[PDB]
Structure 1
Amino acid sequence: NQEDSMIMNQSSIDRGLFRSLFFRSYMDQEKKYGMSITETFEKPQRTNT
């Protein structure tokens, strides 16, 4: 706990002390590139992708 460090009760941590939820959100667009080119939502196949 020297030089601004601290000791935590590992027992307490198990009991839920200081736990937190974490939510990240990923976004994605299906963009339209002009008259013909359009992105697609699908599972890509490794042979033609």
Structure 2
Amino acid sequence: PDHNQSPRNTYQSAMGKQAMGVFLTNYNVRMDTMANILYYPQKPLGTTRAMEYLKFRELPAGQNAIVAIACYSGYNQEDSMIMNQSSIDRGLFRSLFFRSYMDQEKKYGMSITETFE
């Protein structure tokens, strides 16, 4: 982070919060409104030391893309990316997504029940 323009660290610090990883290992067992689990969470090839205490190599949020900085077909201009479709097929950046919905039964209604049927 010492090689970044100052604000850029700030931005990252936010987006990291919207990375998909493996929030918990017990995720299969929690019913939480939104869940995003990465198929193939990889450790970053570029770890930090603080990363150890953060359990990042353990519950990593992201994968190591083979990345080319190239003007290619013209389709990666102004902050788009040309992603490798094949890579996608073989699983790169796939994610589970668990939306879990909740519904209850009646509040106080004198025999005004709600029936799951």
State the TM-score, normalizing by the size of structure 1. 0.72
Question: What is the rounded CA distance, in whole Å, between the counterparts of 2:85 and 2:78 in structure 1?
Answer: 21
Question: What is the rounded CA distance, in whole Å, between the counterparts of 1:36 and 1:11 in structure 2?
Answer: 58
Shift of 1:41: 1.2
Match of 2:91 among 4, 7, 16: 16
Shift of 1:30: 1.1
Unaligned runs of 5+ in 1: 43-49
Question: What is the rounded CA distance, in whole Å, between the counterparts of 1:36 and 1:30 in structure 2?
Answer: 12
Shift of 1:37: 1.2
Root-mean-square deviation over aligned CA pairs: 1.2
Once structures 1 and 2 are overlaid, which stretch shifts more, 15-24 or 27-36?
27-36
Match of 1:40 in 2: 115
Which structure has the bigger radius of gyration? 1
Number of paired residues? 42
Question: What is the rounded CA distance, in whole Å, between the counterparts of 1:7 and 1:18 in structure 2?
Answer: 14
More strand by share: 2
Unaligned runs of 5+ in 2: 1-75
Once structures 1 and 2 are overlaid, which stretch shifts more, 33-42 or 11-20?
33-42
Residue deviations 1:1-48 (CA, integer Å, cap 9, x gap): 011111011011101111111101011111143322111111xxxxxx
Question: What is the rounded CA distance, in whole Å, between the counterparts of 2:113 and 2:92 in structure 1?
Answer: 49
More helix by share: 2
State the TM-score, normalizing by the size of structure 2. 0.34
